[PDB]
RNA sequence: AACUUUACGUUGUAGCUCCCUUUCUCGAAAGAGAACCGUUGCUACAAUAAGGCCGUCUGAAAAGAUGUGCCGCAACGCUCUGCCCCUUAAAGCUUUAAGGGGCAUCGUUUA
DNA sequence: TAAAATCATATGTAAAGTT
DNA sequence: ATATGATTTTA
């Protein structure tokens, strides 16, 4: 078994890992295995919405439609019973036969006349169906609702129906809303008033069925809709005292040597003041700039304290959170003796599931769950690791908004950098080479420092700015004791002045403690200088937490890192030094060590760089930090000229072992660093011979655990999902392969127009439309926003055109909407593969074929449609079944191709595969589109572990069912 | 992360309706009448994943009534189930048995 | 040709609230 | 990203 350190680089859609041996004193000595794990991040890629959004909106809509349908069913039953309809009015399907299709006009007429049973029924069903809007600043629909309400009772109109007809047919031509207008909505209260008024009139005129029974049934149906909805409710004495106290007890003051909570007398002074006084934070230190506290319940009742008690306060808190109305709240309060809500919350060898109560971001939950997968795979394979080193990406834990904000920020800063480099080139025309980062930064610091050597105030000649050994960008506070590479820690000073500083802060160097003249001049310099406030603050740090600062800069206090260190240190058997065995690297320090150790990247081409930073942070042990700190300290105050401790004049960074970058880059990429267009060593034989080959002096790089990197991917072998696309097209013409869809005029372009159904039936319409689209250079949304009519054979305009039909090609459907419509398909959960006569046959299995349980009986032939497709019987040998991201290999004479199954072409009978790391030196983004299967020799799906180990073929027996 | 409703949109079928291709009759032609389609606009009813169910009342079952009726595009996991893989051990490739893991058509959220 | 590789185009949406 | 009509290239 091994003593090893497992490094992890965690992303939103990838987890890279590596294992590095340690010697007894925890130096890096050897590298074993390394891997990547990719999946799909837990959100919709392009719109940032949740993954369950589609499912919940589907649920909401399903329930809405079934509840409305059921409402109408109950209304028909009620009609039949209270005596309006006999059994001759209804037909076989329980649908009232012979309905008047003229309900609005009947409503208006219905307040002057005795109506026969059928039209009374029609209006009643009409009101139940479209039942208006209920209560449950700005407006869009609410504006239209309120406008019609105002018109209806702050005007001369009788009633909503009548009003609607005249007003909406006088200046719109259409009663109902269309295409996202909301002005013709109605308040349910106004529909209710219209209903009662109609009942009065039908009572008056002698309508037979205007009974109390029908009135209650109909009215209740119209108005009734479901009302919106031992753990601790928060607005309770027990909960607010706790939120006050437990969040108070971790407030720390930076003391002389350590941090300290407030003294028992200090905490006592203001424990009871949020009780005794209404308010605070800025006045927390005024007694002992955000809020940080307010006692909501106690002070709400006050606004001389109040005289209540906990048992009563606990009961009123519970009663107000479980109930909303006056009704039940008074009940429990009445026995016991304002608005409340928002209830309160209340070692092995492997890692237990990530607590979804503790972790409530889906992206982070998925990333950490695959992190746990990788961790347990590594453990079961190699035994318990000594240390777990974690480096989690910057975008982990952030909202979609925040991620986008940062994406924006980095584009504008890249534009800025190009502009600044242009200025620098203009300043330095004869500059041999191109601007590097430190040169541009030297220019910025010159401008920022006012062209003054911030340590001496000497004017800096710009001509010599980029002279080797004239100006140097400095670590104001030194790097040995603080590990600060940050931009606020850098000031541009001459080389003449920065040679006797040592590793001293300016306050220990300019004798700031005796407030000497040099310190006064210096503080003035940086104060007036163009640096931000943060920079000025850190340049003049007087005394600080040496150990605190270094720990701060090596450790990430992000929530996910905090929790992850805590959860992997508490609930996991780690063979490490008991003090602190999990480590969350700082982003900038990991970046520094990668860039200084030779793995400065190739900027996202293939999917294996995650292993790079996993390796870089695996190696950040305390012994390595020792070595780096000694080296940096030395170089800080020279001492690199003939001397010795316990010192050659050209010593660069203490890398873990000699030839770190070479070995690591070979193993991770199979090619030597600097040469990414080599011949990849995709075998053990090539990789091991290349490691014994290229690396002469390192025979410790060839052992029995050297395996090439094969990225593992998320297996999504679900058999549920979307049934069909939500655009329903007519199937009347599906005999010949077409289907007609009403395309609205505002969004039909030339290509859509050419397929217009009546192109040979209104050459004047076709011609006007073609003419107009060509006239406006077809941008239809603007080109048809001017009402366009239908001119006669020899005459004036007659009829508006608001949408026109278009026939589109179709050879597949999904018969939806009661076999009345055909829709497109969307999800191919599976592809069953058969082999007869050394030929390979593909059988797509979709997700409606699963809902019905259809096991398809037909394979795919190119060009021929489903009715002329090869049938599959008992003569076909079963091979395997492919789901998305199933590792498959296909061998033919041309090539051998090995990857993850991604697509199956329905038309062409081909399948597409992704490469393991989606590389662009192969295919289209590493997706291999269009692969032969019928003419090939070998076709078999394999296995994959999360690590990449244990890749072995598959043979299946009995063909599985679809349900 | 759940939950109520609304208003559209799409498909189907009706009544009216703006255009119009062919086919039958009347006419010398000019024009008319019609039919089956296609389809512009308006209104209404049915459906609004594909698929599966419940409960209450008369009933002897038949079978009829009835409901603020219900689930179905996700995350995670291994208590149960299915597949696949890995070990381990015994006998003549399977069997038995024990164990472990990956993923789901399995389980919880969830009705 | 038949199969394999390539290219190319279409995917439902606003509102109002509640816990 | 998926699904799939339509088109070109190849044994």
From Swiss-Prot:
Cofactor: Mg(2+)
GO annotation terms (biological process): defense response to virus; maintenance of CRISPR repeat elements
Gene ablation phenotype (knockout): Almost no mature crRNA or tracrRNA produced. Loss of CRISPR interference during plasmid transformation.
Annotated HNH Cas9-type domain residues: 399-554
Molecular-function GO term, any one: RNA binding
The organism's place on the tree of life at top rank: Bacteria
Active-site residues annotated for this sequence: 9, 475
Protein's job: CRISPR (clustered regularly interspaced short palindromic repeat) is an adaptive immune system that provides protection against mobile genetic elements (viruses, transposable elements and conjugative plasmids). CRISPR clusters contain spacers, sequences complementary to antecedent mobile elements, and target invading nucleic acids. CRISPR clusters are transcribed and processed into CRISPR RNA (crRNA).
Subunit structure: Monomer. Binds crRNA and tracrRNA.
Entry text on domains: Has 2 endonuclease domains. The discontinuous RuvC-like domain cleaves the target DNA noncomplementary to crRNA while the HNH nuclease domain cleaves the target DNA complementary to crRNA.
Name of the protein: CRISPR-associated endonuclease Cas9
Organism: Neisseria meningitidis serogroup C (strain 8013)
Gene: cas9
